Amino acid sequence: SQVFGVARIYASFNDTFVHVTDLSGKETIARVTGGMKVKADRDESSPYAAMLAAQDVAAKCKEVGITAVHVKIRATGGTRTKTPGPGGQAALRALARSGLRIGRIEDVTPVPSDSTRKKGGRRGRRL
Amino acid sequence: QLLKIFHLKTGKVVRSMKISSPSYILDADSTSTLLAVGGTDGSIIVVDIENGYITHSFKGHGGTISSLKFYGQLNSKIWLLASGDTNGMVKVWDLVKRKCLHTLQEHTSAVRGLDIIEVPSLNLLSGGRDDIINLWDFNMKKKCKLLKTLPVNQQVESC
C-alpha cells in the first residue's frame, strides 16, 4: 500500500535542486529548482525558494501516487565544500511538513579520494 | 481533499466536507442525487448531493479506485454501485444491503470503464487499459458468471 520514491536534493551555493524519482532513479517524477519559485537570481539559493520548490514537488509526488521517499541529500562536492547548505535543510524540512513519509536520509556528496586543483589558486578565493 | 457541493441555481457552495485521501474519480447517479468518490487509498465514499451527508463508506479495495459506476432506476430497490481499482479488481457493492455482493479479478490492468444494464438479471461491462472488455451476468443472489471477453485492440479509457 506504501509506494516509495527517492527525493534527490542537490543544494548548491547559488541554487537548490529538488528532484524526486523512482527507486532506480532513471525515471524522473518531478524536478523543481530554486529558480522556479523565485524572481531574482540572488534569491535562487534562498531557503525560501527551496521550501516553495519542495512544496511544489510534494504536490506532484502525491498526484502521481508516490507517498513515501528516501532522501539523498548532496552538495557540490568534488573540489568544493562537501556539506549541504541551509537550502537543502529547508527543503528536507518542507518535505517533512508536506506530509510525505521520509524513509531514509543519507549524504551522498561526491568526496574525491584525490582531486584536481581548485579554482582559487595559491592566494585563495571566496573573498 | 475537500469535497465542495455547488448549487447552480442558488449559485453558492451548499456543502463542504473532507475526504480521507485525494480522489480523482467522481461519479453521479442518473437520478442526480448520489455521488461516489474514489480515493487513491481504496476507500469509496457515497454522498447525498441534496442533503450533503455520507450515505455509504465502502473500504474493500486495495489499489487506487480507477472507475465508479452507479446503477439504479427511479422507483426501484435494485440500486447498486460498481467500483474498479488499478489492480484489475472489480466489486459490485450493494447499497440497500450495504455490502459487497460480487468480486471480479479477471482484469489485470486498471479498470477505467464500468457500465451496468438490466437484462429483461443484470449485465456488467468492465473495461480496462489491458485492452480487453469483459461481459458479466449477475443477480442479487450469489450468481456472477463471465460470458464473453472481447479483445478491443485499444486502451479502454471509457466503455
Add this chain to the structure above:
Amino acid sequence: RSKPKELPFFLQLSGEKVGDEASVREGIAHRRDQEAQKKLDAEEQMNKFKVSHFTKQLREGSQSKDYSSLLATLINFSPAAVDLEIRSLNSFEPFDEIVWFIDALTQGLKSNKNFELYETFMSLLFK
C-alpha cells in the same frame, strides 16, 4: 471624567529578522480577542456578585391628574437619582410614561416655583 484610571515554546517569527529576506522580497508577509476577553471580564463580574417609588407615583399622578406628590420627590432625588429615573422611562408605544412625565413638568411650570429644576428636567428627557 470620574472613571478611575486603568513565552510560547514554539515561538512564531518570520521574515527579515529570522534571516528569510527572500520571503520579504517575494512579498509574502487580536482586537476581537480583546473583545472576547472584555466579555469574560463582564461574565466574571456577575459571578462576583450573587445578591420603583418613582414610576408608581407617575402612574397615580396620571390617574388623579395630580403630579404634585410626584414633583415633590423629583426635587428630593439626588442628581444621580434623577438621571437614572429619566433614562428609565419606557420608550414603547403608546409612550404613556413620557406623555405623563411632560404633563407633570407642565404642571410644575404653571406653579412658577422651582423654575430652574423643572427646566433642566426636560433637557434630560430630550437628551
Add this chain to the structure above:
Amino acid sequence: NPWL
C-alpha cells in the same frame, strides 16, 4: 431492574 432499576425501574422494578
Add this chain to the structure above:
Amino acid sequence: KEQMRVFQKPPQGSRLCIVATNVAETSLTIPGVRYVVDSGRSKERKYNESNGVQSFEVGWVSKASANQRSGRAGRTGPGHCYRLYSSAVFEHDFEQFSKPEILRMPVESIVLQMKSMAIHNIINFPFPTPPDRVALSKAIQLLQYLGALDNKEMITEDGKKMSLFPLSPRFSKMLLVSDEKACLPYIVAIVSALSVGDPFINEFELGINKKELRSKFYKSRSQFSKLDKFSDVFRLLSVVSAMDYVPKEQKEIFMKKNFLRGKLMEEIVKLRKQLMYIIKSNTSKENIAVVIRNEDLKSDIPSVIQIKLLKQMICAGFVDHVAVRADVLFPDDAKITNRTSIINIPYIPVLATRTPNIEDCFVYIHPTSILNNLGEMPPKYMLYYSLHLGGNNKTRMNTLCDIASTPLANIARKGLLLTYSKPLTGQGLKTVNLSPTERYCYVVPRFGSTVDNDLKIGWDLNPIAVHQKKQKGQWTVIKFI
C-alpha cells in the same frame, strides 16, 4: 404508476378487483364496478376535547359516506353493495353526516396552519364554518405562550416547525425542545402515556379506600414513586419504562400485581414507536429514511440532572397551566398550618381572573396524586395538565411535576407570559453595559399578569442575572447568566 394500472382495463379471463380507502368512494370514478364491499370504517382526524389530544382513528363513516359507497356499484349498470355491518348499526352508530374537519381540530392547530400560510387576519377571516371568536382569541394567546407566534402575531421559527408536526401544538412543543442531553426517549413516553390515557387503577376504582390488598396497592405505587417525590408525570414514566423489560410471558403477572390496564399499556408501546418517527423525521436530516428500533426506545433511569431538565421540557408545553400556592401570593388570605392536610392546601392558576373573593380562584390537589401521601409542605409552583370540577367540595388538580423559580422563567422567556422589570440597582447590583444596546444586569422577572393588569393574577419570580440586548428600543433578554 400503480393507480395507472388500476385504471388500466383488466385482462381477458380476469375480473377486476379494486380495494382502496374513501378516495375510491368520491375522489375518483371506477368504470365497470358492479360490486362494492363496504367495511364502513374510515380513518379520519379526530380531536378529543376532554384531554385535548389530536389523533387519527379508525371508526364508523357517516350515513352519507356509506350511501356514496353504495352508489358506486351502479354507474355502468345495476349493481350490488355488500356492507360488512348491519342495518341496526347503520341506524344507530352511523352519524347522518360527517363533521367538518374544522370542528375536529384543536383551535390552536387551525390558526397554526392558518398562520403558517402567513395570513394576518384570523379573527375576521371568512371561514365556511367559523369557530367562536372567543375560541380563536384564546388559541392565538395559547400559541404565543408556546412561542409559535411572536408579539406581532407572526409565526416564529418554533412556529414553522410547530406547523410541520401533525400533533396538537402542546405536545409538539415538548418534542421539539427535547433534543438535548438524550432526553428524547423519556419525553415521548410521557406523551404516549398522556395521549393514550392513565394506566393506573386507583384505590377508589379498586374500592379499597382487603387490608392486605390495599397495602399491595400502596407498595406498587411506592415502587413507581422513586423517580421523584413531587411529580406524578414521572410515575407514568416509570410504568412505561418498566413495561418494556417485562417479557411477553410476564405481562399479565406484572399487570395484576401492579393494578394497571393491559390493553392500555400495549397501546402506549405502539404510540412511542410511532411518536419517535414523527420527531426523528422532522428533527433529523434524513427525514424519510429514518426508522425506529425498540433499542432506541429502551433506556436506563434518568440522572438527577436529566430529571430536572425533563421537568423543564414538560413545563415548556404547559407554561400557561402552572399553579402557585396561595400563601405565597396572599398570606393569611386562606388560613394554613402544618395541621392542614395536603389535599386542602389552596393553589392559584397564573391566568385566573381575580374575583372579589379570592377563595373562588383556589384549586386543590387530587388525592390520587403522589403529593397526597407526602406529609410535609408541598412546593410553591405546580405544573398541571388541566383543571376538573369533579368533586363538589373543591376543584381538583391534574398535576405533572414541580418547577422551581429560575427554570420557570427561562421556559416562559420564549413565551409572552413573562415580563421583566427595569435594571436592579443597589447593594452589588451594578448594571454592566458593553454597548449602548447591550448590557448585563440583574432583573426581577414577573410571570403572569402585569402589575398594572389587576384582572389577571401575576406574580414576581426571584431575581436572576440576565443578559439583555436592546432591539427596537426594547431591552430584549438573551440568556440568564
Add this chain to the structure above:
Amino acid sequence: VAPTALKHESKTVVVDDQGKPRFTSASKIKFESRKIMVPPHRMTPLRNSWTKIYPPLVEHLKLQVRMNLKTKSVELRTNPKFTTDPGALQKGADFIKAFTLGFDLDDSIALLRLDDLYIETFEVKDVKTLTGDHLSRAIGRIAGKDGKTKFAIENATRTRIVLADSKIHILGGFTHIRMARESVVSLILGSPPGKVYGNLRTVASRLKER
C-alpha cells in the same frame, strides 16, 4: 447566644417522491523514526546534559525519545496517538544534531523554538590550502586572543561558532550565517582581525537599523 447580644447503519432504503434514493448516514500523524549517531567526544556533554535535553522534546514536541548505548546513538520516534505536528520529528533531529556538532544546549534549543535556523558548515581548506603552522595560526586568528574574535562576530551577526579544529559550523538565519561566512573567511585569507573588527561593527549598525 452570645452574652454580648442585644437584649448501526440501516440495511434499507426509502424512495422519495421524485423517485430518488435516500439512504441512512454511514457510520462516522503516522509512526516514524530518526537515528543520529553521537561521536565519542560529544557524548560526555550529552550524558551530563541529557537531563535538559529530553524534556523539551518529549513534552513540547510530544516525541518519543531514547538513546542507544550499544550503537551510541540517539533515537527519536513519532508517537501516532500523541504527536500532532508533522514537522516535530525532523525538528527534534535537527536540534540534537546541533548539539552533536559541538553546540551549547541552550543555543541548540533555539532550533526547537524557531523554524528558520539552519546549519552552515565548511572547512578551512575549502577557502585556502594552509598547512602546518599556517593552518594552526589561521585557527588562532579566527578565535583570537581568549576567543574574543569569535565572540565579536557572534554578537554582531547573531550566530554561534564552534572551531572544531579545521572544521567550522555556523547557526543562524540565512542572512546571518552568510555574512558570518564572509567574516570568518576574510580572516582565513590573512586579514588581521582588527580590520575585521571594524567591518563587524559596520554591519552591526546596519542590522540594528533594519
